[PDB]
Amino acid sequence: TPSDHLLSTLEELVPYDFEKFKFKLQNTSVQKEHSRIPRSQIQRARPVKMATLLVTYYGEEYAVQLTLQVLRAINQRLLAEELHRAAIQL
């Protein structure tokens, strides 16, 4: 599932880089007519937890786009590309 690819993607994501990931996620624009993840939850959310959260709050397709963009925001173009490639496989 998309959440499984997001899990693995953010699992490979270095925790020290995830620190910035979740900081950029807090500053990520909310998708049209979709539910916002509380910043208090984002700070405490695990790399593997956000995979589920983004899907629940925004959606599967939106979770991939959100994570991809935030990865690029933190100079993780590798994971962003691999996530895109995962979306292609899906």
Side-chain angles (χ1 to χ4, degrees):
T1 63
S3 69
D4 288 338
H5 291 290
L6 290 168
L7 191 162
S8 294
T9 297
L10 296 177
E11 181 180 1
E12 289 179 358
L13 180 62
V14 176
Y16 289 103
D17 289 345
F18 178 74
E19 180 178 359
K20 292 182 181 180
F21 180 93
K22 70 185 192 180
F23 289 170
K24 289 296 183 179
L25 187 60
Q26 287 175 0
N27 292 292
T28 299
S29 177
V30 176
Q31 296 298 304
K32 182 176 177 178
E33 297 180 357
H34 293 288
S35 295
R36 178 183 180 185
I37 299 173
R39 287 180 165 170
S40 65
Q41 295 301 313
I42 292 170
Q43 182 177 1
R44 295 179 182 172
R46 293 182 294 177
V48 301
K49 185 172 180 176
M50 287 181 175
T52 299
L53 291 172
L54 292 171
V55 171
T56 297
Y57 275 83
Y58 303 95
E60 289 176 357
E61 290 176 357
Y62 294 97
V64 171
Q65 289 175 356
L66 287 168
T67 297
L68 193 161
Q69 287 174 356
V70 172
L71 286 171
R72 290 175 64 191
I74 61 168
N75 292 334
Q76 295 296 315
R77 290 178 181 171
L78 176 62
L79 291 174
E81 178 182 352
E82 288 301 308
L83 179 59
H84 179 72
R85 291 179 185 278
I88 292 169
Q89 289 175 357
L90 288 170

